[PDB]
Amino acid sequence: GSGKISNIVHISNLVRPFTLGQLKELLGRTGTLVEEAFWIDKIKSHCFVTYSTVEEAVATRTALHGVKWPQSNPKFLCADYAEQDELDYHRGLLV
Amino acid sequence: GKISNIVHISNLVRPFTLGQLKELLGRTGTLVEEAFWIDKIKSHCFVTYSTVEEAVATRTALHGVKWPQSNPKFLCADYAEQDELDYHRGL
């Protein structure tokens, strides 16, 4: 299970309910988020989390892939690395 | 998440043959055989389909499935761009 390493972690299988503050608290345990790059979809099913270093992104992917969050989520999270092109497609910056 | 003709499947765990994995993958479309890539240790794979619609049928079918039956994990299936595949292939 090896996506190309980068400073962006793509987390899937998120299920409501949860607040953005709760998600951001989980994410900050393993590094420092770049707030200005952060992205989540309207329905809170997946997000792209840019970290201050690549090493923080690797710590976070490692910690979060295959965990259950929130506690009552029926799914386990899928966490992998993402390229800027993928993030920017979702931000509406690239076709 | 960007829709493509390449499905990336992770959380594979042995034992399984390539025959069994390919049979599974073929349930939902035609593979471009020469494009298929798996790691030497059989933990994740990129699967090119002959059309985009076949890749989407596959992603939908396999994301979150436990395969093989013995796998302690559930599969993660998502789309990939050609240059992700090319990175793993060498280029």
Residue numbers in the entry:
A (entry chain A): 1006 to 1100
B (entry chain B): 1008 to 1098
What did the authors write?
Acinus (apoptotic chromatin condensation inducer in the nucleus) is a protein involved in apoptosis and alternative splicing regulation. All of them contain an RRM domain at the C-terminus and a conserved arginine/serine-repeat (RS repeat) region that are frequently present in splicing factors.
The two AcRRM monomers are covalently bound in the crystal structure via a disulfide bond, that generates an interface area of approximately 500 Å for each of them (calculated by the PISA server). However, computational modeling of the disulfide bond removal by replacement of C1083 with alanine, results in the CSS of 0. This indicates that in the reducing conditions the dimerization does not take place and the dimeric assembly is likely to be a crystal-packing artifact. RNP1 comprises residues 1049–1056 [KSHCFVTY], with the deviations found at second, third and fourth position of the consensus sequence (underlined). RNP2 comprises residues 1014–1019 [VHISNL] with deviations at the second position of the consensus. Interestingly, the 10-amino acid-long C-terminal α-helix of AcRRM has a caspase-3 target sequence and can be truncated by this protease down to six amino acids.
